[PDB]
């Protein structure tokens, strides 16, 4: 670390600057790679930027960019230029994690398969570790590179490596040789922007003056709340960080308090409790109490791990999770924002960004009794001489959820002063945490103090406007400087509501009493107009950023304080723009409501929304109010029990005419796997062969000694996983798996054999991805998948030999799908064949009445273990242009069914692995782009019955949301190609 190498992004002990400017860095977390769908980019960047965000953070995951080792590939949907597009489109800042190690809840945390080939130990110095990160970085970091702000793009931040904070007991830690290697990689490929780390926890890694392998600006990660999505209401003791200023302090005091992963959601596991419960745990309450706490301690680059979680689609999830990864984060998965901790989160952003005098004030210890009288409460100040002082408090357990009645006892350029001034006692009702601020600057006005809490406020033209808040029955107070110029006549004019007051002191400062409720108050103050809302009205307040000109005309006139229009009404508020005399809003409506316009442009007099020009009423402070016409229609879907289903089976494997003459042999004596040396003949790891995705089959030929052998087979999938054995044609068993199980012994009978006679087992073994490798020196993520050991012995106890051959997705490492990429696929025999893609070849299909003997539906499924897979045509004709509908999958469990396994895939991209006795996910959102909402869709059903009864599906059914009437760019169908007959197929 020597200091910024250019000057568009610098920094300094209290902030970033970003082209000279202290900017409050506030971020939300995005995967670019769990969205394959490049025109929702923009859709998710409105809704951050709308959140008063700035900035959003990225991972990049390796194992889908290099799924053959040497051939980078970061083509089509896995091109991250239409993302870096989309952020300067919506005028959002991005910081870069390329890895190479991610963990992100990925398969392998970010590496490859082709990693457990290689012997030394990853994350270190080993030398065959660094130069099998070579290409891969060489390559990502040049695409950064050239997308930086020094370039004209949106990248101001690099990230080298993931939470580099400990490692296995006996390992170098940390390393620096290896860490300086990582920012050498970087470097060398171009990145000039500063280097900021995420260390897990406070722990000092890689800051700043800690020499070799020291970072810019030191970052760190917290998830206080923790993820018992169990116990939603449960906040535990001592869950509250209270040492991060001082922390932060004794590690790099010279570099901006960084939370670079702040909790925005929980994962939650196969077996687990549902994303809605760990969004009812990392709810509205938590934000405002937790992030405010942040505030208490002067974070000044803030990013929300997650804002947007997306899906792990074809297999890319670890098998720590399923296929959401909805995250409870404030954007669903399906992109909706209508969880109340979005509109929570809004009013926390919009007032950071009007808020400049936060970056200099020094956050001082949190104290009880010092700013209030009462002991029940906590008050952390942030001070200053004259920029502002702001107070942040929170009940003094801060689980509580009782409410509290007190007063403060603030400083201010007047003295010191208990407030209310006019009376009466402020709340603190349950789980709430508010700042106050004293001195605060409202253009060329000043608020003496106040405890609401302030929304937005701008300096139009002609008039001020400031938007304060406060929950439902809270009364508040404020005291504005004499805001009537040299007026000795001048008085406040009371516009709306009935209950405000205001007294005015000899020296016209003017005091205002009010207690929130749900209807406004407003109140004019010679050219300062202010807006007195409820906590439940302002969560419908927008502040869209008046654009700029040239290629970064989105980031606006500046990102503190920036030009606007300040918007009442609507679901989502995207963008405006002024073109001649007219204000152009971009817009979603979820339920009807008016627009009121609040701040408009000198010289504009016309309006549209949603390019659809409209009247207004004038209201006498010059606001506009307008009633956009909003039709939410009824939606039809088609019923998918009523499709043309066919269905091919997926077991041919265990029929006596199987030929296996093409499949791979598994004939390695010996492995590169260090760290699950091999206890059988062969290696029979899939990543051993170039398998590292989905289903893994194997088939071992013996001779039968006797006519009764024992057979012990040790296979691993991952959690959650499950397997399946046939003898020849025979059903043997499954180990049906459950949430705890990554491994299984099996110990089977194989029982009337012919002696002499040469049988064949078929093995198949699902894998529910690979593991993390978070403890750097525990090789983790080489846990291999597969068979991990067995023994076939006679009834007289002598060994019985077995050759193999393996398979999972076509091809392995040469994998067949470029445009989907490396994971989509596993390597059931419908897979393998490309039977998945559109249009499929239905004459290797069977068609027959539902509910008939020959039903090729999956509603009636199969009457043995065994495979099946099901196709049919969905035709959706949508009205996608005006409305956002989202569209889900939803899997009916019936408590009394034999257990299985599906695979949900459409148009050839893979949306959902269903685990009917592990669950818990049984809706499986599909985003239109992956869906044509205008046409043909191919949708796909892999049933896998585990038991020798059979199974099926008990319901199937496509779900819509309610219709949002959208003004986002139009989504573009994903062109994924058809199905093509696979040359070598097997
Ligand atoms: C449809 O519908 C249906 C109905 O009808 C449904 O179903 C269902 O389902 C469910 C769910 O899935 C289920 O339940 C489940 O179950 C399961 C199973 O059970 C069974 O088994 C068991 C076990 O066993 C074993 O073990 C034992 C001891 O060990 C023994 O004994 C035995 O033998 C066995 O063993 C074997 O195995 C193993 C494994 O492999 C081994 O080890 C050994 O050696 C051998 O091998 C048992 O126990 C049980 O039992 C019990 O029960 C029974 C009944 O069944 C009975 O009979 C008995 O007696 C007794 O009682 C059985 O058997 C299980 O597992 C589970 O459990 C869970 O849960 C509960 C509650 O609920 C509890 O209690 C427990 O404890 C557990 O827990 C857990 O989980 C939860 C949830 O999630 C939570 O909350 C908690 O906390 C816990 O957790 C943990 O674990 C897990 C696993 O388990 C995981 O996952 C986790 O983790 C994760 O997460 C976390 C958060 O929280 C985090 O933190 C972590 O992380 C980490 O990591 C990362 C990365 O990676 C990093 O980064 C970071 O940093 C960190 O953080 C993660 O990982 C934790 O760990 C349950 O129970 C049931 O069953 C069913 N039912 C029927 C009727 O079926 C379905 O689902 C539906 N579907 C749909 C689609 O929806
Ligand atoms: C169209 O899109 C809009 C978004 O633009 C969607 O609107 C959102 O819809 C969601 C879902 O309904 C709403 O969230 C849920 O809100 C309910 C209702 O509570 C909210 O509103 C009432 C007013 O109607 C407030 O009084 C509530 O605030 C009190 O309670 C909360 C605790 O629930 C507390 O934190 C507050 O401080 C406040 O407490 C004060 O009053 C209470 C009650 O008297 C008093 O006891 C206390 O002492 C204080 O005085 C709150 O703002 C809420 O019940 C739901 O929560 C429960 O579920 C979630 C899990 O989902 C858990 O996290 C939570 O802990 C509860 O168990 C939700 O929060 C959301 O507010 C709403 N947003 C807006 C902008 O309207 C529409 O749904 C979309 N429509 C369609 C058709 O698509
Ligand atoms: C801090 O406040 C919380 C919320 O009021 C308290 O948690 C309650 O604790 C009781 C007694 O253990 C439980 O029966 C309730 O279920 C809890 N409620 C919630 C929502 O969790 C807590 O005890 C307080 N802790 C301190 C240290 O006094
Ligand atoms: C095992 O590692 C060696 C280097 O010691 C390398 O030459 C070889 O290609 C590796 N095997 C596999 C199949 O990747
Ligand atoms: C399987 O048994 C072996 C002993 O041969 C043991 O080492 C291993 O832990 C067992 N695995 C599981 C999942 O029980």
Not at 17 to 30: A, M, N, T, W, Y
Not at 292 to 301: D, L, Q, Y
Not at 837 to 859: A, E, I, V
Request: charge should be neutral; hydrophobic fraction near 35%; charged fraction near 15%.
């Amino acid at each position: 670390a020597k200091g910024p190498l250019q000057n568009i992004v610098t920094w300094d002990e209290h902030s970033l600057f970003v082209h000279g400017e202290r900017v409050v860095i506030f971020s939300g977390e995005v995967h670019p790679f769990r969205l394959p769908v490049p025109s929702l980019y923009l859709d998710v960047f409105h809704k951050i930027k709308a959140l008063g965000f700035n900035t959003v953070s990225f991972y990049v995951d390796w194992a889908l960019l290099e799924g053959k080792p040497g051939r980078f590939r970061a083509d089509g949907i896995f091109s991250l230029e239409p993302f870096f597009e989309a952020a300067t489109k919506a005028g959002i800042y991005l910081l870069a994690r390329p890895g190479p190690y991610i963990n992100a809840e990925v398969s392998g945390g970010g590496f490859p398969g082709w990693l457990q080939r290689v012997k030394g130990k990853l994350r270190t110095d080993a030398p065959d570790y660094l130069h099998a990160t070579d290409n891969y970085v060489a390559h990502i970091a040049s695409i950064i590179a050239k997308a930086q702000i020094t370039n004209g793009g949106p990248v101001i931040l690099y990230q080298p490596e993931n939470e580099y904070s400990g490692a296995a007991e006996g390992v170098l830690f940390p390393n620096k040789p290896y860490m300086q290697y990582v920012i050498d990689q970087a470097r060398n490929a171009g990145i000039i922007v500063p280097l900021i780390n995420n260390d897990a926890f406070p722990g000092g890694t890689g800051a700043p003056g800690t020499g070799l392998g020291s970072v810019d600006i030191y970052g760190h990660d917290g998830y206080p709340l923790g993820f018992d999505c169990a116990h939603p209401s449960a906040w535990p003791d001592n869950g509250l960080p209270t040492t991060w200023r001082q922390d932060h302090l004794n590690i790099s005091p010279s570099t901006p308090f960084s939370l670079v992963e702040f909790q925005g959601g929980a994962f939650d596991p196969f077996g687990g409790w549902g994303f809605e419960q760990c969004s009812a745990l990392v709810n509205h309450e938590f934000e405002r109490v937790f992030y405010k706490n942040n505030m208490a301690a002067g974070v000044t680059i803030f990013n929300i791990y997650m804002t947007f979680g997306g899906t792990n689609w074809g297999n890319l999830g670890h098998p720590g999770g399923y296929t959401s990864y909805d995250y409870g984060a404030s954007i669903r998965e399906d992109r909706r924002i209508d969880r109340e901790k979005y509109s929570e989160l809004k009013l926390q952003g919009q007032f950071l960004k009007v808020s400049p005098g936060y970056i200099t004030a020094t956050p001082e210890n949190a104290t009880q009794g010092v700013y209030s009288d009462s002991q029940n409460i906590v008050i952390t100040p942030l001070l200053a001489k004259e920029s502002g002082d702001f107070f942040v408090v929170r009940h003094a357990n801060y689980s509580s959820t009782d409410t509290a009645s007190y007063t403060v006892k603030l400083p201010t350029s007047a003295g010191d002063l208990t407030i209310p001034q006019l009376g009466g006692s402020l709340t603190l009702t349950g789980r709430d945490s508010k700042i106050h601020v004293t001195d605060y600057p409202v253009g060329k006005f000043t608020l003496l103090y106040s405890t609401a809490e302030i929304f937005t406020w701008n300096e139009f033209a002609e008039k001020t406007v400031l938007v304060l808040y406060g929950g439902a029955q809270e009364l508040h107070e404020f005291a504005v400087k004499n805001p009537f110029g040299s007026s000795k006549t001048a008085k406040a004019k009371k516009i709306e509501g009935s209950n405000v007051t205001i007294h005015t002191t000899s020296n016209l400062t003017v005091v205002l009493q009010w207690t929130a409720s749900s209807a406004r108050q407003v109140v004019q103050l010679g050219s300062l107009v202010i807006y007195m809302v409820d906590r439940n009205s302002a969560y419908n307040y927008w502040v869209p950023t008046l654009p700029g000109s040239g290629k970064q005309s989105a980031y606006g006139s500046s990102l503190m304080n920036p030009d606007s229009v300040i918007i009442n009404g609507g679901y989502l508020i995207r963008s405006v723009a002024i073109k001649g005399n007219a204000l152009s809003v971009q817009a979603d409506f979820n339920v009807t409501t008016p627009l009121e316009i609040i701040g408009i442009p000198k010289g504009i007099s016309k309006l549209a929304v949603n390019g659809k020009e409209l009247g207004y009423s004038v209201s006498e402070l010059g606001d506009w109010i307008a009633h956009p016409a909003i039709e939410i229609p009824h939606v039809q879907v088609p019923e998918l029990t009523k499709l043309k289903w066919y269905k091919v089976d997926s077991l041919p494997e265990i029929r006596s005419n199987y030929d296996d003459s093409r499949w791979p042999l598994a004939n390695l004596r010996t492995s590169n796997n260090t760290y699950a040396p091999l206890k059988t003949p062969v290696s029979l790891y899939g990543s051993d062969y170039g398998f590292h995705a989905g289903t893994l089959l194997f088939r071992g030929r013996f001779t039968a000694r006797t006519a009764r052998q024992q057979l012990f087979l040790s296979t691993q999938g991952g959690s959650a996983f499950a397997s399946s054995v046939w003898l020849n044609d025979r059903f043997i068993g499954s180990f049906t798996g459950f949430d705890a199980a990554s491994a299984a012994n099996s110990s089977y009978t194989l029982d009337r054999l012919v002696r002499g006679r040469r049988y064949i087992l078929t093995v198949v073994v699902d894998s529910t991805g690979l593991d993390e490798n978070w403890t750097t020196g525990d090789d983790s993520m080489k846990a291999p998948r597969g068979i991990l050991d067995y023994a076939l012995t006679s009834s007289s106890g002598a060994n019985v030999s077995i050759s193999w051959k393996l398979t999972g997705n076509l091809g392995g490492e040469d994998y067949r799908d470029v445009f989907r990429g490396p994971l989509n696929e596993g390597g059931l025999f419908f897979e393998r064949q490309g039977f998945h893609l559109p249009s499929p070849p239905l004459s290797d299909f069977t068609h027959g009445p539902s509910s008939s003997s020959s039903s090729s539906s999956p509603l009636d499924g199969i009457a043995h273990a065994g495979i099946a897979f099901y196709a049919a045509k969905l035709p959706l004709h949508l009205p996608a242009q005006e409305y956002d509908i989202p569209l889900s999958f939803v899997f009916d469990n019936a408590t009394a069914a034999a257990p299985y396994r599906a695979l949900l895939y459409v148009n050839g991209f893979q949306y959902g692995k269903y685990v009917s006795n592990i669950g818990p996910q049984t809706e499986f959102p599909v985003p239109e782009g992956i869906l044509d909402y205008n046409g043909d869709n191919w949708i796909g059903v892999a049933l896998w019955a585990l038991e020798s009864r059979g199974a099926k599906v008990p319901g199937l059914a496509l779900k819509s949301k309610s219709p949002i009437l959208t003004g986002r760019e139009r989504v573009e169908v994903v062109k994924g190609p058809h199905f093509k007959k696979r040359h070598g197929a097997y």
